[PDB]
From a paper:
Gram-positive bacteria, including the common wound-infecting Staphylococcus aureus, the virulent food-borne pathogen Listeria monocytogenes, and Streptococcus pneumoniae that causes pneumonia, utilize cholesterol-dependent cytolysins (CDCs) to attack and kill mammalian and human cells. The bacteria produce and release CDCs as water-soluble monomers that attach to cholesterol-containing cell membranes, where they assemble into large, 200–500 Å cytolytic pores. X-ray structures of pneumolysin (PLY) from S. pneumoniae show that the soluble toxin monomers are roughly rod-shaped and consist of four domains (D1-D4). Sequence comparison suggests that all CDCs have the same domain structure and therefore insert into target membranes in essentially the same way.
Author numbering: -16 to 471
Write the structure that this text describes.
């Protein structure tokens, strides 16, 4: 360069071709590391935890805690807001922590005409294109909403234009963990979902979270040939610097926006079973099998909360609640796309303005995975109705855990051991879930001088069933025993 294409003033006139050229040269001369700019990491924690047991009202839980790491690399960004005027196709966003935190900084400057393509089953190749003179949230939304009307009446009457369903499920352990899985924008929906994390950590409940995305249509932007093509000539280099744009804080443009319906489902249960994964997964498909008790027990102690974005009327977020029957219809609500369904942004993708390279975000965190094993409390019932004097010898161990996680077995005994008991005698011995090595011996006095005692019942390591009833009866010479187990 030199004199030509330059004013004699040495200045670059606002609203001229030279200004747009200076801007174009300014963006192209930017040097930055793509990956470092879009990298964020959450909590970092040590990897040594203790084994612990806690006594619940009706259960003894053994809790194992282990460090796990979550890492995701994706170019798609989930939307959890509805009144967001920043998230329109073609919008220029600033690359900083606000972008990673899913609270973007919008570069609102005089914009040049931009062309948009929209994918729809009925729209012909030629009719899909769309030109907006001054791309803003109102402008692009108008042109899209206008085009939907023409398509709906023309072709959109064929009903089976099914939404694209997408499933994302994950076990909940921490907020940081969920942000990595669902994006940093999840914290808004996570606050309305009421995720109880302490109870998961204490082994009280197990929580699973499900995504549901149904995409009606997506609006796209063609590749930007020159970085300056996006601005009007009124936009000047000193204007971009005034707004803090540089190689350290470069520019990105929303290249695609997904429009449709989105549901966030939360399933927390007090069940400690390890078929919880199978119960929730079977539930989502609505295929409740015919057994009466095996899965219904956990489900009836499972209660559900949901958050709905999109669907019928354009009003933003709907929080719904119930148990299980309604889950099947939530998926069914947005199955069909109508013009009655406006559809709203649920996901968008960004590309760097300088070279149209799609921006990928690297997110990671350490989280404490919680594993739980429960042991139900039980009862030991004794009934003596025999024609003799009987003696009981009932012993067991109580499992406890050390400060360093060692197993501790504390010997226990019925306080009535060895005592002469006579009919009719009954008692109930409450046994907590941490009871191990339960042994029950029963002897009876025969009254015979040469063999005073007769063993009547002797068992070791008796399983801790819900209700066990040992009943003895009969006579000195012919004692009778019954061991009845009630478990369900």
């Amino acid at each position: 360069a030199h004199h030509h294409h330059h004013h004699s003033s040495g200045l670059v006139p606002r609203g001229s071709h030279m200004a747009n050229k200076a801007v174009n040269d300014f963006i192209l001369a930017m040097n930055y590391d793509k990956k470092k700019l879009l990298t964020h990491q959450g909590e970092s924690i040590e990897n040594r935890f203790i084994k612990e047991g806690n006594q619940l009202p009706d259960e003894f839980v053994v809790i194992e805690r282990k460090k796990r790491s979550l890492s995701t690399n994706t170019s798609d960004i989930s939307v959890t807001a509805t009144n967001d005027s920043r998230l329109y196709p073609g919008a220029l966003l600033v690359v900083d922590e606000t972008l990673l935190e899913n609270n973007p900084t919008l570069l609102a400057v005089d914009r040049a005409p931009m062309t948009y393509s929209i994918d729809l089953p009925g729209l012909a190749s030629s009719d899909s294109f769309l030109q907006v003179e001054d791309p803003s949230n109102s402008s692009v939304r108008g042109a899209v909403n206008d085009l939907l009307a023409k398509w709906h009446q023309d072709y959109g009457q064929v009903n089976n234009v099914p939404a694209r369903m997408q499933y994302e499920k994950i076990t909940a352990h921490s907020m940081e963990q969920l942000k990595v899985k669902f994006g940093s924008a999840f914290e808004k929906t996570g606050n309305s979902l009421d995720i109880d994390f302490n109870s998961v950590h204490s082994g009280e409940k197990q929580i699973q979270i499900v995504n549901f995305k149904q995409i009606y249509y997506t609006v796209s932007v063609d590749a930007v040939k020159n970085p300056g093509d996006v601005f009007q000539d009124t936009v000047t280099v000193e204007d971009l610097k005034q707004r803090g744009i540089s190689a350290e804080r470069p520019l990105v443009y929303i290249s695609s926006v997904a429009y449709g319906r989105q549901v966030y489902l939360k399933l927390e249960t007090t069940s400690k079973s390890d078929e919880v994964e199978a119960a929730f997964e079977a539930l989502i498909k609505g295929v409740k099998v015919a057994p009466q008790t095996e899965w219904k027990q956990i489900l009836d102690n499972t209660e559900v909360k949901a958050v709905i974005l999109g669907g019928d009327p354009s009003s933003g977020a709907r929080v719904v609640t119930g148990k299980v029957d309604m889950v099947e219809d939530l998926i069914q609500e947005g199955s069909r796309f109508t013009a009655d369904h406006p559809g709203l942004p649920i996901s968008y993708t960004t590309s760097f303005l300088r070279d149209n390279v799609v921006a990928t975000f690297q997110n990671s965190t350490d989280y404490v995975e919680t594993k739980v094993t429960a042991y139900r409390n039980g009862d030991l019932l004794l009934d003596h109705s025999g024609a003799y004097v009987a003696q009981y010898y009932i012993t067991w161990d109580e499992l406890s855990y050390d400060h360093q996680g060692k197993e501790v077995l504390t010997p226990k005994a019925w306080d009535r051991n060895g005592q002469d008991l006579t009919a009719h005698f009954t008692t109930s011995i409450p046994l907590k879930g941490n009871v191990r090595n339960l042994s029950v011996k029963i002897r009876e006095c025969t009254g015979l001088a040469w063999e005073w005692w007769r063993t009547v019942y002797e068992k070791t390591d008796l399983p801790l069933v819900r209700k066990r009833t040992i009943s003895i009866w009969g006579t000195t010479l012919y004692p009778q025993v019954e061991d009845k187990v009630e478990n369900d």
